[PDB]
Design a protein around this ligand. Structure first.
Ligand code: NI
Length: 341
């Protein structure tokens, strides 16, 4: 059954609650972003209103074939009414189209649901600064202090210099980048840009990217593999066996593959700096795993919650075990005591 942390009290709303059939008493289903765990259950046969951003909107229409009449896109940073309730969608700094939602309840309670987010100081100067938030439905993906990672800027600098260097030394080297969902486009686009190439991908993935309202996107991507030296593949295929195979496919146009696996966190973040990262090499094929996160680090999360000073916090990630739940509650109590709310 639909769990409690997907329900918004004193409304008939749910958030990311599409895999439970008809939820008893839901008049409107919100979708925070186009990732499968979140949209799981949607299809062309869904006949209740869905509320979402314009971009998530384009992907439901064209990737899932949901009927236009049921998609309700809303602009960001704008006070809107949905079944008698004031709401606002805010940028989540997760993947394209990803939003946080503010609900203003009839009784005067204010509720922020973060969806998936990477907390940032820029959020402290949004519509959030203008009033008090009583309840916080929080992406707690990395709520533990071991979870440090570099900024997105630093990681992009690394990958750019790595790729430029390798291709200037050996002009017959191919760059390959792994992907399995939206998000993390900056990796492959920034590499393509330093290298004077467009990115080449499958038809399904080109379609996916054509939905994202990216500026000058027609100039940055293609379905013509051959005319491009930055290729996207299924993340599954990023390994020595799957790369060697793909190397054959290019027909002696390239002798070396340099490839990037944008991970979330990996235990090597507990020891090594971004400057000191190294690849796995098997002959003419190297694989870098780079820690490009679209979720808050522990410290970014902590700062945002201590700035927001909510009265109650409800987790949406790592909720399935008592050990996780108990650990999170401990950190929430530390933050509240250190900051005095
Ligand atoms: Ni997500």
């Amino acid at each position: 059954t639909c769990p409690f942390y997907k329900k918004i009290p004193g409304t008939g709303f749910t958030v990311d609650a599409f895999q439970y059939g008809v939820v008893e008493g839901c008049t409107a289903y919100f979708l925070t972003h186009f990732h499968s765990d979140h949209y799981a259950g949607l299809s062309k046969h869904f006949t209740f209103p869905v509320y979402c951003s314009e971009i998530t909107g384009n992907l439901l229409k064209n990737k899932l074939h949901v009927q236009e009449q049921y998609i309700h896109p809303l602009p960001l940073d704008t006070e809107c009414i949905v079944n008698g309730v004031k709401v606002v969608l805010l940028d989540a700094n997760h993947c394209p189209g990803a939003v946080m939602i503010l609900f203003y309840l009839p009784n005067g309670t204010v509720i922020l649901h973060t969806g998936d987010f990477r907390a940032d100081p820029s959020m402290e100067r949004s519509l959030l600064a203008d009033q008090k938030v009583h309840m916080l439905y929080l992406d707690t993906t990395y709520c533990s202090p071991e979870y440090t990672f570099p900024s997105q800027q630093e990681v992009i600098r690394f990958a750019i210099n790595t790729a430029f260097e390798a291709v200037t030394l050996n002009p017959h080297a191919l760059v390959v980048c792994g992907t399995y969902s939206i998000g993390k486009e900056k990796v492959f686009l920034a590499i393509a840009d330093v290298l004077g190439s467009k990115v080449g991908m499958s038809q399904e993935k080109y379609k996916t990217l054509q939905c994202l309202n990216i500026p000058e996107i027609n100039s940055l991507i293609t379905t013509d593999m051959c005319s491009s030296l930055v290729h996207l593949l299924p993340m599954m295929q990023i390994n020595f066996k799957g790369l060697q195979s793909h190397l054959k496919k290019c027909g002696g146009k390239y002798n070396q593959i340099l490839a990037f696996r944008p991970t979330g966190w990996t235990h090597s973040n507990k020891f090594t700096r971004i400057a000191d990262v190294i690849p796995q090499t098997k002959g003419n094929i190297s694989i870098y795993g780079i820690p490009y996160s679209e979720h808050s680090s522990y410290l970014e999360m902590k700062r945002f919650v201590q700035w927001l000073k909510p009265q109650k916090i409800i987790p949406t990630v790592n909720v399935g075990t008592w050990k996780s739940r108990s650990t999170m509650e401990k950190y929430f109590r530390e933050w509240k005591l250190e900051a005095g709310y």
